[PDB]
């Protein structure tokens, strides 16, 4: 299929090298030498694009979402942190009911969204804890320390970085039901995600220790799935 | 859409009551009073069926898989334990390459299959441990005891019950890479599933404590997804 990739950062260039595409349109405010892509200069959704993939920034999701939705394409979004904004979220799904498009929210850096999606109406609450090494926060500590705790909306305001995982989760069960905790642990070599889910159907715990590659393959699997006979999860 | 549900056990009757369907064809060796379904007597795939759902038994998967695949429908399978059979597995995906159909393997009683599907080529091994209460095995114990450990193929031969979770997993990463452990813990009130995944991309831990309802909603979410604009995981 022909596709439009928004953003040529670590994830964009990676999709271009691993993906199998006849044609690739790419838009990125910068202008680095483009390899096997048709670097656009003015954003737009070419008529032969069957799928659009956003992997730029929350602001990009907000800037083009409206236009993208006019077109009858599969719309893959990863910068979900943008949905932590009540006003933008309302606007988006409005355009979507009228839209001929289809939106896909791949799990990204976490997993367990298959069951969380199935039992979403029954979820009582979701606790997502991120444990980063002190170094990655310019901190020197002798023990674990909570650097933040509250809603997804607030977490995004102070951490314009991640807060994408929690947002996709919020988009599934409702934001009011998600609590975010960011912990700095001097004993931690790498980043970790722990998703604790309480519901009327059962309780689930998902621990993620990524050694972001996971998100890349998460996108690829979604694209591959569009054209596959064997679908898992 | 019009659908064909194979098996009217706990899961079949549940799909009939919660599902939203214009027409339902149902086949079940028994003959209990059927409510809102068109109880067939001779198995077959009516021409107006757009989706078939198996939730009967592994033997059923093996008996009708061949026929189902001739038809251009979405084929949902849950009794995956049947794929632990090397010979049947080879036969199935053979028919599928030639098939106009599409197969869906919902996560069922576990979760985390979204990430496991994305990073499947990189998986080094998967350990799935099931911790049941001694009572559910007619055992009286004073401490945890392993009642079984080995491959998915063997687990199915001694436990014609579950071994479906491990099979779907085997279908994803390859059976040789899955190790199954069934533990009886006197301290355990309910059943638990722990899926430990080791790979080149990272390590994942999924703990599942279901209070099977999860599988039902897992099927429903797959059906709902066929006709939805918002897809998660
Ligand atoms: N959902 C998840 O699990 C998950 C995980 C990791 C990253 N992400 C998201 O992916 C994004 C980062 O991707 P990356 O790793 O390639 O980072 P990156 O910063 O290396 O790449 C971003 C690229 O997009 C371009 N860009 C920024 N705004 C743009 C805009 N408004 N319009 C067009 N182009 C724009 C930038 O010039 C940059 O080259 C982040 O926004 C993050 O939220 C999501
Ligand atoms: N993948 C998962 O996570 C998962 C989880 C739970 C159960 N399951 C599967 O679901 C099945 C059980 O479903 P249930 O909970 O409704 O159980 P059940 O035993 O109550 O229902 C099974 C029904 O299917 C009928 N049946 C059996 N063989 C048939 C055949 N060959 N052809 C036509 N009909 C047949 C039976 O008469 C019975 O009424 C099991 O085979 C199990 O492997 C999968």
């Amino acid at each position: 299929m022909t596709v439009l990739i928004i953003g040529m950062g670590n994830i964009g260039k990676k999709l271009v090298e691993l993906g199998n595409f006849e044609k690739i349109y790419a838009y990125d405010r910068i202008s680095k030498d483009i390899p096997g892509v048709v670097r656009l200069d003015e954003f737009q959704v070419p008529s032969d694009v069957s799928t659009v993939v956003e992997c730029a920034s929350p602001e990009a999701v907000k800037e083009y979402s409206l236009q993208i939705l006019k077109n009858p394409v599969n719309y893959i979004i990863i910068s979900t942190s943008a949905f932590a904004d009540e006003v933008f979220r309302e606007r988006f799904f409005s355009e979507l009911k009228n839209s001929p498009a289809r939106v896909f929210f791949p799990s990204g850096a976490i997993g367990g969204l298959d069951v969380l999606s199935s039992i979403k109406d029954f979820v009582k609450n979701v606790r997502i804890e991120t444990i980063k090494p002190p170094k990655s926060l310019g901190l020197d500590l002798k023990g674990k320390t909570v650097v933040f705790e509250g809603s997804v909306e607030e977490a995004s305001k102070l951490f314009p970085r991640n807060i994408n995982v929690a947002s996709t989760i919020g988009l599934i069960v409702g934001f009011e039901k998600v609590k975010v905790t960011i912990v700095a642990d001097p004993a931690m070599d790498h980043n970790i995600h722990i998703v604790r889910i309480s519901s009327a159907i059962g309780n689930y715990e998902f621990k993620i220790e990524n050694i972001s590659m996971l998100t890349v393959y998460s996108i690829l699997r979604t694209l591959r799935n569009l054209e596959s006979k064997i679908i898992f999860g």
Side-chain angles (χ1 to χ4, degrees), chain A:
Chain A
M1 69 190 110
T2 293
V3 306
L4 163 56
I5 301 299
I6 298 172
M8 283 297 128
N10 307 303
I11 298 174
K13 288 181 288 177
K14 210 76 171 66
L15 284 174
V16 172
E17 51 172 284
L18 295 167
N20 297 310
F21 302 125
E22 42 179 39
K23 186 197 289 190
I24 306 180
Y25 292 102
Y27 185 59
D28 188 306
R29 281 157 72 173
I30 68 174
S31 297
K32 182 192 297 183
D33 305 288
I34 57 86
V37 313
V38 185
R39 160 85 65 169
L40 294 62
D41 289 57
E42 304 317 305
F43 176 94
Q44 54 159 293
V45 187
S47 175
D48 54 334
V49 167
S50 77
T51 299
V52 185
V53 175
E54 176 283 317
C55 49
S57 70
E59 286 55 62
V61 171
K62 300 179 172 185
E63 294 181 63
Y64 320 114
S65 282
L66 15 64
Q67 192 180 322
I68 308 300
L69 300 176
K70 300 298 173 169
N71 310 289
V73 287
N74 295 303
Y75 188 12
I76 291 175
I77 301 177
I78 72 180
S79 286
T80 61
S81 64
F83 283 76
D85 169 3
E86 332 179 301
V87 183
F88 171 69
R89 172 162 73 268
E90 184 282 317
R91 186 165 74 65
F92 181 92
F93 294 88
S94 304
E95 305 165 6
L96 190 47
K97 279 193 170 186
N98 314 161
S99 165
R102 197 166 182 187
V103 186
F104 292 85
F105 284 108
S107 303
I110 53 153
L113 298 194
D114 47 9
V115 23
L116 185 55
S117 167
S118 301
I119 50 84
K120 68 188 194 170
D121 287 313
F122 303 89
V123 179
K124 297 179 288 189
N125 68 68
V126 178
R127 289 165 297 176
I128 166 67
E129 175 194 17
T130 301
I131 309 162
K132 291 184 142 72
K135 184 179 186 181
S136 72
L137 290 66
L139 304 166
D140 108 87
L141 311 171
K142 306 301 181 308
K144 305 180 308 183
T145 302
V146 171
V147 298
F148 169 98
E149 191 181 58
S151 78
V152 182
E153 179 164 51
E154 318 183 312
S156 184
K157 293 279 72 63
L158 286 66
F159 291 109
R161 57 169 61 275
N162 212 304
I163 288 58
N164 285 83
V165 180
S167 289
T168 297
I169 285 176
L171 263 171
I172 297 179
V173 307
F175 291 71
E176 83 272 39
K177 298 192 184 180
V178 194
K179 177 167 66 66
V180 174
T181 297
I182 313 308
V183 174
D185 191 337
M188 289 300 91
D189 194 341
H190 49 296
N191 290 326
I192 305 179
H193 292 282
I194 301 182
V195 178
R196 305 189 174 71
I197 301 161
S198 170
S199 81
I201 304 303
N203 296 137
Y204 317 89
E205 240 234 28
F206 300 122
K207 204 184 78 178
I208 312 297
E209 286 180 61
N210 287 157
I211 300 171
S212 182
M213 299 179 95
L214 176 56
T215 303
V216 185
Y217 291 93
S218 174
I219 307 314
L220 296 174
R221 173 61 61 222
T222 290
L223 296 168
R224 306 242 304 182
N225 278 322
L226 303 174
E227 296 288 298
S228 170
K229 297 183 176 183
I230 327 287
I231 296 78
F232 294 100

